[PDB]
Write a protein that binds this DNA or RNA. Sequence first.
RNA 1: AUGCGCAGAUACCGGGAGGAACGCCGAUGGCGAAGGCAGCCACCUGGUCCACCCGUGACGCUGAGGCGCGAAAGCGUGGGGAGCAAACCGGAUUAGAUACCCGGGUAGUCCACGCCCUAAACGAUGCGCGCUAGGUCUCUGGGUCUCCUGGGGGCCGAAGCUAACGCGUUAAGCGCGCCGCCUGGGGAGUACGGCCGCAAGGCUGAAACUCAAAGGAAUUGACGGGGGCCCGCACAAGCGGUGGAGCAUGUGG
Lengths: 119, 70, 155
Amino acid sequence: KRQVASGRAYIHASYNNTIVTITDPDGNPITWSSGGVIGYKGSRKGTPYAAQLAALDAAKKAMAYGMQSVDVIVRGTGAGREQAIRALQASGLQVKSIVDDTPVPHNGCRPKKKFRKAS
Amino acid sequence: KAKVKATLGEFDLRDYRNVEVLKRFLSETGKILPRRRTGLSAKEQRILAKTIKRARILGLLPFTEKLVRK
Amino acid sequence: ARRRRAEVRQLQPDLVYGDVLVTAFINKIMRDGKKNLAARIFYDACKIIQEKTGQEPLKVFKQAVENVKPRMEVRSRRVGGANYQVPMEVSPRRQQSLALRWLVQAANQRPERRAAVRIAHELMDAAEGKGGAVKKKEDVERMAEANRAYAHYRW
RNA sequence: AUGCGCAGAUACCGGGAGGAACGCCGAUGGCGAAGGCAGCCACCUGGUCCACCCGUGACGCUGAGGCGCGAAAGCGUGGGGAGCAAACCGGAUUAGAUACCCGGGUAGUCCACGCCCUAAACGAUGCGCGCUAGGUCUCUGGGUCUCCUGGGGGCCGAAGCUAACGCGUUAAGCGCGCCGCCUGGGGAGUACGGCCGCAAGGCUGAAACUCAAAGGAAUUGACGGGGGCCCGCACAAGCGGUGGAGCAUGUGG
């Protein structure tokens, strides 16, 4: 399969799970992983450890395509943000630079009762 | 810190084209800085917020940036 | 222990090898304050380590213990819901406590009829690293790993 | 768990459509009579503050009724419909769960035009004017710009007031003018009548009967599935036991 020397690592870190997708320099997925993709189920998929496993899985899967360094892009604030980040650093696979690009409306749609409790 | 007013001489804070000055009033996330940081007065900051927004619509200033190294 | 930290109660050196670790182990052998009978056993058992191997008892001993100390274990914990086996590092003083306790328990689990033998063969099977003590010790260590997912709760 | 995903979803990149709301600035901030008002730009338009001391010459205050405005939800006609979400459809939970949690979802939320006219529509404090120490923070004018001097917003608090809590030149002080309103609790914002409304219902608003109270503020306790800080073999850490057997002993039957 194609050689991609470097590209991008997206950490989507939610309260409920962490997913990691790895892409070529243009943002087309190369491989991905997650708490479900490792063995875990439901609640455990959250957990900083799941995050680690998943980041590591996604990286190792991607080094297979001879990928060797990445830019990191984090999204969410969630139990596993920084484990996913430390994991990519410790994965070999050189981490060029971390950016947080979590989205935020410039006040937009009414949220679900769940995320409104502050009246 | 430093105060962003203490870094300049006379500037027309109604001049919505002066990106070089106007820009020094945004964060690294490109958000209008609080007065805690700008060192302007209420009256002034009111006129600034108005001019920056104009610059923005014109394409000369950001609405947001991504935070680098988080 | 609400007020204090409680001093690690300090023990009386082994009157025969000169080792605090030994007395400790003699005490764990003791039943109803029969300290005499207890030491008979430990020593008669050091007897059975020469009579069976070339090396010094104090050495088999020190070593058997070393293998039986666990490095991590699960401590139970309250969370919003039910409970969590939370793995965490096991403090040196406790490591020791657990080792000895386990050696003596594992010993009296064995089949041979006379105590000094049981103690000895267990001590021997331990430094070689295959006693039922080292077993119920890898069970702990393994179980602390099973639960590696919850290691973000350690106080 | 329901649910969605191999008709390839989640995550990621590019393009498009659409609806709704405006992040930072943002404040202890401002504006309005209230309701209320927040991206930016134009236009149309209301109020208001200061300085000058120029004009009129008491032209003032208040205001039964009338008329107008009036959050949300709701009504009618026609649009719109992204996200949210009564009802409703499911999944959990539970002793049950017509709920809290989870997945869906219609009205509605949005616009135009016409209704409705309510509220913890609150500062729970009608409007105007005069008088009665100060300190400090703040928005906005002016001056001879340490400061001084107007008009807002705050807090502390002279005198004084108050049942107390508090209030205190933004009065709940000292006074005058005018309006509105109260007269023990339940029955009841109910019945009846009238008026209004397309409807929902609104405004006005009783009686019989019944009670010895209903109430306000503060006090000392006690209590909290409130908070802080402490302690005890209280828990944890251990070591040996009872619960099982036989018997001894006390007890219930």
